[PDB]
Amino acid sequence: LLHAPATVCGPKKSTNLVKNKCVNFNFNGLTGTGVLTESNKKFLPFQQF
Amino acid sequence: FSALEPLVDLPIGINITRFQTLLALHRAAAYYVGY
Structure with missing residues (x-):
């Protein structure tokens, strides 16, 4: 871990559509x-946005 | 009037002091700088 910005990280989950x-x-x-x-x-x- | 849009951003986090351009050679143009 350094002062440099993170370039590699873990995944993320996605949820289903809803309205x-x-x-x-x-x-x-x-x-x-x-x-x-x-x-x-x-x-x-x-x-x- | 001008309308400039964001192209891309690369986080590298390195100290930047000096700046210069790169041209081409062969075997008439103008350009500016704004601060």
């Missing part, structure tokens, strides 16, 4: 409560 239920979530560190409903507005080809 229309007010349930907790976690997307790339974003944990909150809401209804994961679909959208129409389009993002940039590199935006994840």
Whole structure:
């Protein structure tokens, strides 16, 4: 372990799809409560927020 | 007006002091620097 940023690490598990239920979530560190409903507005080809 | 987008980021964590460019030779162009 060094001051350099980590380049290799362990894996991560993925859950199944779900909608229309007010349930907790976690997307790339974003944990909150809401209804994961679909959208129409389009993002940039590199935006994840 | 300009609109610049992120290409890629590589964490290497090394001290960087000096900078320079690399050109080509053969056997007329301009470029700038901003701080």
